[PDB]
Amino acid sequence: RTTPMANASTIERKWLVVDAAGKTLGRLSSEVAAILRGKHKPTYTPHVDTGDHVIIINAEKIELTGKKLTDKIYYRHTQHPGGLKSRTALEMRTNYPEKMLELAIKGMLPKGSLGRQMFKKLNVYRGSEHPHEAQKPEVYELRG
Template sequence: MSTQIALTLMGKHKPIYDPAADCGDYVVVVNARHVEVSGRKAEQKVYYRHSGYPGGLKEIPYARMMERNPSEIIWKAVSGMLPKNRLRAVRLDRLLVFPDEKHPYLANITKAYDTKIPLQCSPIE
């Protein structure tokens, strides 16, 4: 799912794609609380951050991150798949992740991706 989101944020699905231009679309992700990972990632995956001070390394296991902020898991996965350049922050601003079904952008969504792999796109009637 994260790879499809990254491609849409970059605009690679459009015929006018240019690596130096920002031509991507907004992406709204709902039900982030119900994300499942394959293998033993749920037990083994750890998220790291550092405060910049000596001894400031923080470790957060996947299970605790899922309880506290499930939308952060998707945000970090997509962030890691985008190119590391000046457009990265702009593209991530267009990623809107919601932990549940409710969100204020229901009227603006033009395409819905199915849960099947590979992801299928269908227009909303």
């Protein structure tokens, strides 16, 4: 019947800049996940990517509550026996702040092919400066 469906021809992506400084990792990430998916758009269509591009600046200034800086471990496994490796959140934020944000958001996106495509619209930067001036990105202020 009549429910409109977005498609490649119809879709128009904005670029947005989110400042991570002073934001809680998960609270910021949940909002950004929703923007990359396109959940803020009335033309949201579940089988295409209706989301916007997001730049995150000041990734190393992201905050964590509690004792998470010391106590949140990022595990990975190399698929070699005994190959569990770990970094603390402090080690992550100091030396891999872009990965830290990318992991949080990646875990909040849908998991298959379109989800993987949705992640490609994210761009995370350690500093205050991003290289995407030519895309003319607007500041997006995170809601509650």
